[PDB]
Amino acid sequence: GLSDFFTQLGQDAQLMEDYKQNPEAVMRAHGLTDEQINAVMTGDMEKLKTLDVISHGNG
Amino acid sequence: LSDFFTQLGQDAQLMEDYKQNPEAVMRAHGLTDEQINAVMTGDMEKLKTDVISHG
Amino acid sequence: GSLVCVGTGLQLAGQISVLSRSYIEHADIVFSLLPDGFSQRWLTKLNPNVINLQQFYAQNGEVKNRRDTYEQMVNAILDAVRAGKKTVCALYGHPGVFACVSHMAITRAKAEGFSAKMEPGISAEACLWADLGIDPGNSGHQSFEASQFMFFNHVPDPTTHLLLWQIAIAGEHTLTQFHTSSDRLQILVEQLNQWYPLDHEVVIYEAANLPIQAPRIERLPLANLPQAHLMPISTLLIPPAKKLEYNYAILAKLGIGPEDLG
Amino acid sequence: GSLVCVGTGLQLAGQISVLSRSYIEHADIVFSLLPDGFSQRWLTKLNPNVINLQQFYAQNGEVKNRRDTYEQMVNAILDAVRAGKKTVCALYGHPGVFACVSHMAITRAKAEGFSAKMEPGISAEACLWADLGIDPGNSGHQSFEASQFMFFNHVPDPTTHLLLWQIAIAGEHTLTQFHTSSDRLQILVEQLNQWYPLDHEVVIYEAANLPIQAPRIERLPLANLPQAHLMPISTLLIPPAKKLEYNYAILAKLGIGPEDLG
Numbered sequence: 001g002l003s004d005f006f007t008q009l010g011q012d013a014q015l016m017e018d019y020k021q022n023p024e025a026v027m028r029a030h031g032l033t034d035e036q037i038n039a040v041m042t043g044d045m046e047k048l049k050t051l052d053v054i055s056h057g058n059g
Numbered sequence: 060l061s062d063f064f065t066q067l068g069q070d071a072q073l074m075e076d077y078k079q080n081p082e083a084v085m086r087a088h089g090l091t092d093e094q095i096n097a098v099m100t101g102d103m104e105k106l107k108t109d110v111i112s113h114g
Numbered sequence: 115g116s117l118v119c120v121g122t123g124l125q126l127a128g129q130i131s132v133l134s135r136s137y138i139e140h141a142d143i144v145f146s147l148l149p150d151g152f153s154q155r156w157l158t159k160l161n162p163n164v165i166n167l168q169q170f171y172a173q174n175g176e177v178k179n180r181r182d183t184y185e186q187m188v189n190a191i192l193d194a195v196r197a198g199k200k201t202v203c204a205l206y207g208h209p210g211v212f213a214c215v216s217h218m219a220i221t222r223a224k225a226e227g228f229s230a231k232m233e234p235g236i237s238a239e240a241c242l243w244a245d246l247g248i249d250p251g252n253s254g255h256q257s258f259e260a261s262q263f264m265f266f267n268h269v270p271d272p273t274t275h276l277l278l279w280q281i282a283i284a285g286e287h288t289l290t291q292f293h294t295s296s297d298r299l300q301i302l303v304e305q306l307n308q309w310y311p312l313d314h315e316v317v318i319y320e321a322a323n324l325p326i327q328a329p330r331i332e333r334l335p336l337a338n339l340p341q342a343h344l345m346p347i348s349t350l351l352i353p354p355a356k357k358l359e360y361n362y363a364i365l366a367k368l369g370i371g372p373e374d375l376g
Numbered sequence: 377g378s379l380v381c382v383g384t385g386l387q388l389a390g391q392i393s394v395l396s397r398s399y400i401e402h403a404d405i406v407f408s409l410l411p412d413g414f415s416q417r418w419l420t421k422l423n424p425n426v427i428n429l430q431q432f433y434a435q436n437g438e439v440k441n442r443r444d445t446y447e448q449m450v451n452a453i454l455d456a457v458r459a460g461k462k463t464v465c466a467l468y469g470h471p472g473v474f475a476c477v478s479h480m481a482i483t484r485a486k487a488e489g490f491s492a493k494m495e496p497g498i499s500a501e502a503c504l505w506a507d508l509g510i511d512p513g514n515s516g517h518q519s520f521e522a523s524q525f526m527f528f529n530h531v532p533d534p535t536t537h538l539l540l541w542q543i544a545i546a547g548e549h550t551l552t553q554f555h556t557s558s559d560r561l562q563i564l565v566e567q568l569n570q571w572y573p574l575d576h577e578v579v580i581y582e583a584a585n586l587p588i589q590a591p592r593i594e595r596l597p598l599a600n601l602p603q604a605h606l607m608p609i610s611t612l613l614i615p616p617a618k619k620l621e622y623n624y625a626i627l628a629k630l631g632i633g634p635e636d637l638g
């Protein structure tokens with residue numbers, strides 16, 4: 001549910017521009033719970049997931 | 060011609076098919092001999108007949 | 115109205131991001147600035163409502179400051195926004211990498227109270243790393259616009275990979291000509307000679323624009339640069355003149371030595 | 377068997393090339409290194425035959441040199457290639473920017489007579505320019521790996537935008553830790569002080585990985601860096617600290633001056 005929405009939102013510029021206009025409305029219509037929406041609005045990436053170094057400089 | 064390039068640049072199946080056999084794939088898409096010749100000699104002008112920084 | 119400047123990448127059709135393509139597709143109007151007519155076609159099939167900014171460039175041996183060129187570009191882009199049109203600027207590569215128009219249009223947009231953003235694209239730089247098989251993080255990376263490096267005081271780190279963009283107009287002050295001269299590029303060779311020997315191998319790079327086209331990766335001594343054939347899309351790569359040497363000063367503060375490096 | 381390394385960009389799903397996406401789609405097998413589980417779900421849907429390279433990172437707080445992690449990744453990729461599989465390596469962002477796994481795999485693949493190439497992608501650097509409305513061309517650009525900047529001799533140009541990648545492990549010489557210490561970061565500050573004052577505003581940047589996520593753009597004085605909260609994905613932007621001095625020496629050879637600069 002949550003993952004499906006994010007995938008689409010990232011690809012679909014229509015939906016993206018829809019989300020920018022009214023985030024809560026778009027999210028509620030895609031089935032996101034309150035906790036999920038709350039996490040999004042507070043930017044708690046940690047919780048959302050709940051609900052990167054590939055080199056070095058040692059020569 | 061412009062149709063082939065658009066496909067080729069977007070489609071990775073077609074790309075890999077081209078890199079197996081450029082001529083065969085090009086001929087299969089109806090490119091002429093002078094068109095193919097232009098590709099193999101890397102002459103982009105014949106096939107076709109930017110600065111936005113200052114300071 | 116709204117603004118979104120996107121990048122098309124360097125390669126035809128396929129090197130644009132998925133999101134960025136979708137923006138072109140759903141735009142009310144599109145302002146383009148693409149390397150050729152093949153992409154221009156592709157664009158028109160994506161979205162028929164396109165105004166090609168190329169028209170604002172100097173036409174007909176006309177003396178025009180590139181500045182005055184960009185002004186009109188921005189202005190036109192804004193006109194559509196101020197009309198209420200969901201507008202998009204489709205530029206080649208990354209919309210904000212050595213690209214003045216987009217940044218100027220986003221700024222003017224926001225300041226007039228419109229929604230404006232920039233979506234990153236694949237630049238000529240990004241293409242160079244993959245074509246040459248060079249990782250910028252290996253010994254570091256530096257990028258300057260050729261003319262700016264010749265006009266102001268820039269000190270390069272000769273252990274890094276050094277890029278000079280727009281090398282073809284290096285020293286072209288008037289900003290009216292489409293290319294420089296041999297003597298301009300000769301003075302660049304002497305300038306660079308502070309750090310790089312005359313026989314130091316450099317690379318003239320040109321990322322391909324078409325899928326059937328191989329890139330230009332021409333190696334030559336720094337001395338032969340003024341006789342080289344350069345195009346507006348030519349970037350100059352100057353590999354490290356020196357190898358990485360240890361920084362004992364800091365290693366000491368870290369209370370370590372080379373042998374301690376993992 | 378063959379090898380194509382691609383990037384998926386930073387943002388989920390939408391920031392990969394159209395071509396790069398197709399490559400994943402048609403691949404016999406995909407070796408992935410992605411930021412999160414949303415990105416890992418998206419990939420699996422695109423192609424179910426995925427091996428997650430993440431596994432080769434130190435597990436359960438074991439001491440393991442990252443060099444070894446990388447070697448294992450590279451070998452796993454080649455194992456598939458050698459077996460005759462049309463293999464794709466999908467790394468986040470640009471696959472050959474501050475990432476050695478792709479350059480090593482490609483290199484080894486060629487030397488074993490296999491077709492191998494790299495498709496450019498959108499990197500954290502590409503994202504930076506766009507997010508902070510900066511054109512790297514304005515006053516030039518410089519990038520180094522933070523630890524290398526400390527361990528080896530690098531002199532920055534204070535007129536350019538400077539970037540220190542992997543700032544979170546700045547000065548971690550063992551390559552067995554995930555982060556560094558405030559002491560290390562303090563040594564960095566004192567080192568940087570050769571060029572930048574202590575109160576010089578710097579920026580902790582983190583490009584968003586999700587579409588509903590805003591980027592981190594935290595401004596602070598250089599001195600406060602050691603106390604700052606850094607993450608593996610954090611990049612440090614050090615904006616210019618110095619005025620451009622006229623290369624009067626070169627302008628003269630050009631036979632011009634500032635007033636003639638278009």
Ligand SMILES: Nc1ncnc2c1ncn2[C@@H]1O[C@H](CSCC[C@H](N)C(=O)O)[C@@H](O)[C@H]1O
Binds near residue numbers: 109209239281322347
């Ligand atoms: N195909 C190409 N190959 C190599 N360098 C290129 C290039 N296209 C543009 N450049 C570089 O960029 C300069 C123009 S500025 C435009 C750059 C573009 N926004 C990008 O994403 O790269 C040229 O003078 C050259 O230095």
Ligand SMILES: Nc1ncnc2c1ncn2[C@@H]1O[C@H](CSCC[C@H](N)C(=O)O)[C@@H](O)[C@H]1O
Binds near residue numbers: 583
């Ligand atoms: N989301 C992000 N925002 C900012 N910098 C990031 C980032 N993800 C990775 N980085 C930078 O890249 C380093 C990891 S190396 C991987 C880089 C990636 N291939 C790219 O093309 O960007 C981090 O230590 C940090 O310096």
Ligand SMILES: [Zn+2]
Binds near residue numbers: 250255257
């Ligand atoms: Zn760079």
